[PDB]
Design an enzyme around this catalytic site. Structure first.
Site, PDB file in Angstrom:
ATOM      1  N   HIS A  87       1.005  -1.211   0.091  1.00 44.77           N
ATOM      2  CA  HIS A  87      -0.456  -0.379  -0.368  1.00 44.77           C
ATOM      3  C   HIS A  87       0.648   1.201   0.223  1.00 44.77           C
ATOM      4  O   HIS A  87       1.969   1.573   0.404  1.00 44.77           O
ATOM      5  CB  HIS A  87      -1.174  -0.068   0.639  1.00 44.77           C
TER       6      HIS A  87
ATOM      7  N   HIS B 169       1.512   4.127   2.014  1.00 42.38           N
ATOM      8  CA  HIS B 169       1.911   4.145   3.406  1.00 42.38           C
ATOM      9  C   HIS B 169       3.959   4.576   3.607  1.00 42.38           C
ATOM     10  O   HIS B 169       4.008   3.212   2.647  1.00 42.38           O
ATOM     11  CB  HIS B 169       1.468   3.951   4.717  1.00 42.38           C
TER      12      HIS B 169
ATOM     13  N   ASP C 204       6.100   3.142   5.325  1.00 38.92           N
ATOM     14  CA  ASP C 204       6.269   1.693   5.190  1.00 38.92           C
ATOM     15  C   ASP C 204       6.111   0.613   4.464  1.00 38.92           C
ATOM     16  O   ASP C 204       6.487  -1.037   4.856  1.00 38.92           O
ATOM     17  CB  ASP C 204       5.759   0.783   7.148  1.00 38.92           C
TER      18      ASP C 204
ATOM     19  N   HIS D  12      -6.969  -1.872   6.421  1.00 38.79           N
ATOM     20  CA  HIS D  12      -5.917  -0.813   6.586  1.00 38.79           C
ATOM     21  C   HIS D  12      -5.964   0.377   5.789  1.00 38.79           C
ATOM     22  O   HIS D  12      -5.619   1.110   6.836  1.00 38.79           O
ATOM     23  CB  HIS D  12      -4.689  -1.298   6.864  1.00 38.79           C
TER      24      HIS D  12
ATOM     25  N   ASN E 242      -2.218   2.143  12.746  1.00 41.08           N
ATOM     26  CA  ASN E 242      -2.880   3.820  12.472  1.00 41.08           C
ATOM     27  C   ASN E 242      -3.501   3.830  11.618  1.00 41.08           C
ATOM     28  O   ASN E 242      -3.295   2.721  10.593  1.00 41.08           O
ATOM     29  CB  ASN E 242      -1.073   4.212  12.527  1.00 41.08           C
TER      30      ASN E 242
HETATM   31  C1  LIG Z   1       4.388   4.965   7.825  1.00 45.08           C
HETATM   32  C2  LIG Z   1       2.435   4.424   8.908  1.00 45.08           C
HETATM   33  C3  LIG Z   1       2.930   4.505  10.865  1.00 45.08           C
HETATM   34  C4  LIG Z   1       3.648   5.965  11.189  1.00 45.08           C
HETATM   35  C5  LIG Z   1       3.483   4.799  12.229  1.00 45.08           C
HETATM   36  C6  LIG Z   1       2.923   4.170  13.427  1.00 45.08           C
HETATM   37  C7  LIG Z   1       1.990   2.847  11.896  1.00 45.08           C
HETATM   38  C8  LIG Z   1       1.147   1.911  12.518  1.00 45.08           C
HETATM   39  C9  LIG Z   1       0.699   1.117  14.125  1.00 45.08           C
HETATM   40  C10 LIG Z   1       1.079   1.896  15.459  1.00 45.08           C
HETATM   41  C11 LIG Z   1       1.166   1.444  15.775  1.00 45.08           C
HETATM   42  C12 LIG Z   1       1.069  -0.078  16.368  1.00 45.08           C
HETATM   43  C13 LIG Z   1       0.896  -1.075  17.538  1.00 45.08           C
HETATM   44  S1  LIG Z   1      -1.009  -1.236  17.461  1.00 45.08           S
HETATM   45  C14 LIG Z   1      -1.226  -3.274  16.498  1.00 45.08           C
HETATM   46  O1  LIG Z   1      -1.313  -2.460  18.763  1.00 45.08           O
HETATM   47  O2  LIG Z   1      -1.884  -0.145  17.890  1.00 45.08           O
HETATM   48  C15 LIG Z   1       1.270  -1.531  15.136  1.00 45.08           C
HETATM   49  F1  LIG Z   1       1.282  -2.123  14.836  1.00 45.08           F
HETATM   50  C16 LIG Z   1       0.990  -0.491  13.808  1.00 45.08           C
HETATM   51  C17 LIG Z   1       0.356   1.090  11.005  1.00 45.08           C
HETATM   52  C18 LIG Z   1      -0.194   0.088  11.190  1.00 45.08           C
HETATM   53  O3  LIG Z   1      -1.165   0.494  11.546  1.00 45.08           O
HETATM   54  O4  LIG Z   1       0.182   0.068   9.585  1.00 45.08           O
HETATM   55  N1  LIG Z   1       1.376   2.377   9.817  1.00 45.08           N
HETATM   56  C19 LIG Z   1       1.993   3.557  10.590  1.00 45.08           C
HETATM   57  N2  LIG Z   1       1.928   5.676   8.229  1.00 45.08           N
HETATM   58  C20 LIG Z   1       0.143   5.627   9.099  1.00 45.08           C
HETATM   59  C21 LIG Z   1      -0.527   6.669   7.954  1.00 45.08           C
HETATM   60  C22 LIG Z   1      -1.567   7.345   8.273  1.00 45.08           C
HETATM   61  N3  LIG Z   1      -1.851   8.719   8.762  1.00 45.08           N
HETATM   62  C23 LIG Z   1      -1.063  10.000   9.332  1.00 45.08           C
HETATM   63  O5  LIG Z   1      -0.997   9.397  10.488  1.00 45.08           O
HETATM   64  C24 LIG Z   1      -1.792  10.785   9.444  1.00 45.08           C
HETATM   65  N4  LIG Z   1      -1.318  11.551  11.089  1.00 45.08           N
HETATM   66  C25 LIG Z   1      -0.995  12.066   8.837  1.00 45.08           C
HETATM   67  O6  LIG Z   1       0.216  11.601   9.077  1.00 45.08           O
HETATM   68  N5  LIG Z   1       0.732   7.848   7.919  1.00 45.08           N
HETATM   69  N6  LIG Z   1       1.849   7.072   7.445  1.00 45.08           N
HETATM   70 ZN   LIG Z   2       1.814  -0.588   8.286  1.00 45.46          ZN
HETATM   71 ZN   LIG Z   3      -0.274   1.719   6.551  1.00 40.45          ZN
END
Ligand SMILES: C[C@@H](c1cccc2c(-c3ccc(CS(C)(=O)=O)c(F)c3)c(C(=O)O)[nH]c12)n1cc(CNC(=O)[C@@H](N)CO)nn1
Ligand SMILES: [Zn+2]
Ligand SMILES: [Zn+2]
Length: 232
Positions: A85, A87, A89, A150, A181
């Site tokens: 996707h 993002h 990561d 997601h 997130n």
């Molecule tokens: C780069 C990505 C991103 C960054 C930081 C954290 C994550 C998480 C995440 C968070 C907590 C947990 C533990 S848990 C399951 O116990 O909760 C986990 F396992 C994964 C995920 C995901 O869940 O896949 N991805 C993230 N990401 C997402 C976004 C969306 N947009 C915003 O955030 C806005 N504020 C714009 O900036 N942007 N980048």
């Molecule tokens: Zn992720």
């Molecule tokens: Zn993501």
């Protein structure tokens, strides 16, 4: 020393590999985002004498370190990469891959979302994945679009030789107490998308989440549970 890697074993900038099955590894790296540190996973699948990469290591320097770790531990060239996707990561590091000669791929939906968000953009478009339930072959894997979860564009990856299901960020680890997130998620559709995954891959033996520890098929139902508790 054999256990699944975590941040306490992973400083940001380092990459570790974990053997999942014959010819299948996950990659694990750590990154800081909004002042907190997170692990994230990707996949490596042997494709004869080449490698298929699924997802970057979350950042340019992490992805450079990933390539170096693959050369150290495996020694076969990464020739193609798929981002599951839009993002960072999943696509952060695509520019590094492209400058290392790796052909980068994603669905048109991921490419449009990445471009609109200012994230790195995979070169090549993966057609045939625009409707939920669609699947296509890509080297030694099957790519599957389960529907919005997601993110609207999230893809999952199945390795049929090993019955390995890489769920990406549509699947959470068992210890998760929250749905991660969810800024770009569809919490209402997510359980239906997970049900499609469950129906399509009932013989999966290992399930790998986008972040955290692999396990078995239970990760799918657990994900539906944590998402439902989030929505409510
Ligand atoms: C780069 C990505 C991103 C960054 C930081 C954290 C994550 C998480 C995440 C968070 C907590 C947990 C533990 S848990 C399951 O116990 O909760 C986990 F396992 C994964 C995920 C995901 O869940 O896949 N991805 C993230 N990401 C997402 C976004 C969306 N947009 C915003 O955030 C806005 N504020 C714009 O900036 N942007 N980048
Ligand atoms: Zn992720
Ligand atoms: Zn993501």
């Amino acid at each position: 020393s054999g256990e699944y890697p975590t941040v306490n074993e992973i400083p940001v900038g380092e990459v570790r590999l974990y053997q999942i099955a014959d010819g299948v590894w996950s990659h694990i790296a750590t990154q800081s985002f909004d002042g907190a540190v997170y692990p994230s996973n990707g996949l490596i699948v042997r494709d004869g004498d080449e490698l298929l990469l699924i997802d970057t290591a979350w950042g340019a320097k992490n992805t450079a370190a990933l390539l170096a770790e693959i050369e150290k531990q495996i020694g076969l060239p990464v020739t193609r990469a798929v981002s599951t996707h839009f993002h960072d990561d999943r696509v952060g590091g695509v520019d590094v891959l492209r400058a290392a000669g790796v052909a980068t791929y994603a669905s048109p939906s991921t490419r449009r979302l990445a471009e609109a968000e200012g994230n790195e953009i995979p070169t090549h478009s993966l057609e045939g994945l625009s409707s939920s339930g669609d699947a296509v072959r890509f080297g030694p894997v099957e790519l599957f679009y389960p529907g919005a979860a997601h993110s609207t564009d999230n893809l999952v990856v199945y390795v049929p030789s090993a019955n390995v299901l890489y769920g990406g960020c549509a699947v959470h680890e068992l210890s998760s107490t929250s749905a991660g997130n969810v800024a770009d998620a569809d919490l209402a559709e997510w359980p239906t998308s997970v049900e499609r995954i469950q129906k399509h891959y009932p013989e999966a033996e290992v399930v790998i989440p986008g972040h955290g520890l692999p396990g078995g098929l239970d990760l799918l139902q657990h994900t539906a549970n944590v998402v439902k508790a989030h929505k409510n």
